[PDB]
UniProtKB/Swiss-Prot annotation:
Reported impact of residue 121 to E: Found in mismatch repair deficient cancer cells; also found in a cutaneous neurofibroma from a patient with neurofibromatosis; somatic mutation
The species this protein was found in: Homo sapiens
Consequence the record notes for mutating residue 570 to R: In mismatch repair deficient cancer cells
Consequence the record notes for mutating residue 328 to D: In a cutaneous neurofibroma from a patient with neurofibromatosis; somatic mutation
Protein name: Neurofibromin truncated
Amino acid sequence: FSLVISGLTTILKNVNNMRIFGEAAEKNLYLSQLIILDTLEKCLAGQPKDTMRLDETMLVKQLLPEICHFLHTCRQHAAELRNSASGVLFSLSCNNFNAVFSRISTRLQELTVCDNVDVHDIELLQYINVDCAKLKRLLKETAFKFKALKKVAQLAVINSLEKAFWNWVENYPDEFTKLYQIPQTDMAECAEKLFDLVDGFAESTKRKAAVWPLQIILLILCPEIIQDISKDENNMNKKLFLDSLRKALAGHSRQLTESAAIACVKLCKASTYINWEDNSVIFLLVQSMVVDLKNLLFNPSKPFSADVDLMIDCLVSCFRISPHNNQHFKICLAQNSPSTFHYVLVNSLHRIITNSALDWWPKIDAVYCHSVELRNMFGETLHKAVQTDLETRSYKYLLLSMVKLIHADPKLLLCNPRKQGPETQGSTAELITGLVQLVPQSHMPEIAQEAMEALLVLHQLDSIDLWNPDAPVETFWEISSQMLFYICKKLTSHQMLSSTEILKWLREILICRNKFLLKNKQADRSLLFYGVGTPPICRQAQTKLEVALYMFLWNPDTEAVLVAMSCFRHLCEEADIRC
């Protein structure tokens, strides 16, 4: 506990207090500090809250210049260090929240009386873990210090508060619904005071646009007030603010419309976070501007505003609230739709499959109705990089996105019932063949690695069974033989600049093939008639396998010999299993 924290803090301070005059020294320190921060964050997460590390106030004060040794001034390794420090501070807030809040309050009080920048050490609430009572207390402090503060300080507090509320929603997606279930008078009063303070800063279009993202959130924080606005003099400012948005959202300037669209997307995200069963007219309020948002973002002729993130967020929110209303997705599944539309749709589907709370949020289902078209688009892509510059870069990124999608879920594209005869060459087999051809491609290595790991992911027996409902074993063996042919010809061609990784993944593929063969043999002894007795394709595939393996022992590298010997052991294992 305390001793480990002290040692880690001393090590981190020594690392931060360095020189790194040379070139490789900075790169080495970038990894060293990242590893140290990861270890510290893991240690803090493991340490129970019952430790009560209030005695670590000195350690927290040291970490203020140590954990924020690079985020104090806040001027790629910097991004990784920032992420590590954010995680560390989030872990700290679980136990030493009081010291962090005291430091934040002291910094705010000092900066109010105090000109380049002073939000540093005062915007620490940005990465601080939030709680309902903690959020209410911070709102009270903001109410008590907003007026007698600089405009820059007020804007910094607003920016910290918006994503602090986002953090509270994400970490605690139960108190947010609790507020709309059981009202809290203190939170409502704090939200009203914050709204009044924000309405104090409504200088011009820029200031109003900046306030709108917070103003919408604060309005959401008051359910009863929002309900009453539709039907008082005290509510005149909120009705005026909403009206403004509607029009700025009605396209009648550009900056105001963009800010209003961002605020309405945040509204949609909050409504998704809001109770689906208990709409409380929040869903209706969102739907009042969902049509305008659809006409803004999802109009092909109308250019977007940045665009990808907002489009994905809006699509995810629309799917969450209305899974059946898949008209926008259907519009994105159009040839005339831009490649950006396809990229946004792919990202939306991935994040549906990726991390998401198991709330009223719909699952990956109800998206298989468009699986045929989904594979139609990536077939239309046909890997134009191997089959002006901006289009090629967009296509390559879109290829990487679909590969990551397949990583997340194979079942999205595996719905291929047409694979009966010659149509199999335009089916699951075509998908696997196209995925394989990416590996030898030297134009882009990251896509090769991603598609390679995707082939590994689809090669497990669970993904194997989702290929041919009639005779999965025969089609599996045939396609595996085809890809083994291609890989062996590529390897014997001796143009594999990354031959080490290729050999490793080939070992994995062989291991999975032998595991599936053992599973089939235990299921059915007799495969036997498809490569064990043109000659059988499996025999030729094994011949290519052993030829390439014999080539590997001759490779002038060093780690490849071990790979080839492990592959020899696995070939012996599969030969034993087949008998």
